């Protein structure tokens, strides 16, 4: 992976959540997520994918991952996906948008999905 | 997994894309995705998560998954995440919204992400 | 407006909501919206814009509009924007995605915005 | 309008775009938008709505607006809607998410809509 070492590690977003990830040579993302907000406590499993051979023209590295909000402590009957790009450098960043879908009845499905944006950095 | 057997299998969306998934007892989703549209050919690896203990009140089962659009044939320097819910029954469905992020330069990052919605069924 | 007459009128979405709109020659959209779901009763003012000189290559006509969910009956302290395209023909459609933002405290702002998709037709 | 005076004026986002708006007592937003990026030059008409009687519990004020990207100079056959909330104070802000839909053929409609997020301030 061209950015395998740049992506692997601990990241933090603007909410104070902690994203712990390992980037595999094959494009895999594996790790844990701890949300500072919402119906969440402690760590949750995450899995995702990244472009392991990104362009060399200065572009970011596309990636995404999922958390289902069930662990041994809580189950919020919901899943978030983050879709974004890694941008390397002295101030490396992962800039994302996300979709949080909750399980709902059919009558409430129109209101099942929140959208937002998180920026992750190696400090904070 | 309460819906492990309902989710595992081959699904098709309204574009004619093919989503092949296995739901594990631990909440994992693993499989392949073949898109009928865009800069894509043949199968791509996917990974994701689902709620393996959903509510029993008639609500759907939250889930999500990621594809990075690199395989042995092509690399579109992009990743899609689908966030949604599985709804079981004689006409089972997976209803999703998705975010497709491309690696971009910083100057083009404002236009990095497409959004849309796919519905998957067991027929088509 | 090339599609002024095609857009003006009463439309209905998959939820049973009623979208009453007038397209002006200058690109304006004006009318009322009645939602069949959520914290809403009776009609709300809407305003928006459309491309009054669309491409002639078979493409749809881009448009968007806003409703703030305050009227003489209720105030849900929220606003929805629909962004989409009009597609003319015997089965005319307006295909949209939407963002529903609620006023929140700063601590809850991460969960302020719902996303979804509505399809409007001239029948239903 | 409770925030009529707070909203009316000139705002700037993180891209350097200029949002000039008047908030009416009736909930209307009217003004012009100038984008620093994309297929845009000079000012475009905008219209939208805001909650003219927001909650008094510290919550933001919900609002939204639309620009169709046609003016006397250019027509990009597209429309953006911004959905967000105004947050008053010494560092007032309008925090938004947006959907940019382009007119497309049916075959390309899956890729018609970009999503992003802009923050507007009274300085910059
Ligand atoms: O809260 C969660 C799980 C944790 C999500 C944290 C998000 S992920 C994106 C963002 N980035 C982060 O680092 N943290 C946050 N899921 C339900 C969200 N519900 C609302 C909500 C908001 C705040 C508090 C409680 N509920 C929805 C709901 C739908 C139906 C019934 C009930 N509730
Ligand atoms: O096309 C892909 C990969 C395949 C995506 C298929 C999607 S996933 C959601 C939806 N559901 C499906 O089953 N299929 C589709 N990624 C790039 C999208 N580009 C546009 C695009 C659209 C159509 C054709 C070519 N390009 C973006 C781009 C950003 C910068 C430079 C260049 N291109
Ligand atoms: O319900 C509304 C106004 C009507 C929206 C109808 C939408 S517009 C898109 C879609 N298309 C339609 O035709 N109808 C619907 N706004 C608040 C949404 N709240 C959830 C909600 C969902 C269901 C019932 C009550 N609340 C949010 C909330 C955030 C904080 C506190 C409290 N509530
Ligand atoms: O560029 C525009 C109009 C200006 C949008 C500025 C946005 S609004 C949200 C954000 N906030 C701002 O202040 N500025 C920006 N519309 C087309 C976007 N196209 C891509 C694009 C991106 C960059 C340059 C040219 N094209 C799409 C396209 C779809 C089919 C064919 C062709 N093109
Ligand atoms: Cu909740
Ligand atoms: Cu390349
Ligand atoms: Cu972003
Ligand atoms: Cu492309
Ligand atoms: Cu439960
Ligand atoms: Cu949907
Ligand atoms: Cu509500
Ligand atoms: Cu043209
Ligand atoms: Cu759509
Ligand atoms: Cu363009
Ligand atoms: Cu109130
Ligand atoms: Cu935001």
Numbering used by the authors:
A (entry chain A), B (entry chain A), C (entry chain A), D (entry chain A): 11 to 134
What does the publication say?
Our work utilizes biotin–streptavidin (Sav) technology to develop artificial metalloproteins (ArMs) that mimic the active sites of natural copper metalloenzymes. By engineering ArMs with aromatic residues within their secondary coordination spheres, we systematically investigate the influence of these residues on Cu reactivity and oxidant activation. Our results demonstrate how the inclusion of aromatic residues within the secondary coordination sphere influences the structure and reactivity of copper ArMs.
The premise that S112Y is modified due to its positioning was supported by LC-MS (and MS/MS) analysis of the trypsin digestion of 2 and 3, where treatment with H2O2 resulted in only minor modification of the DF31 peptide (G and S20†).
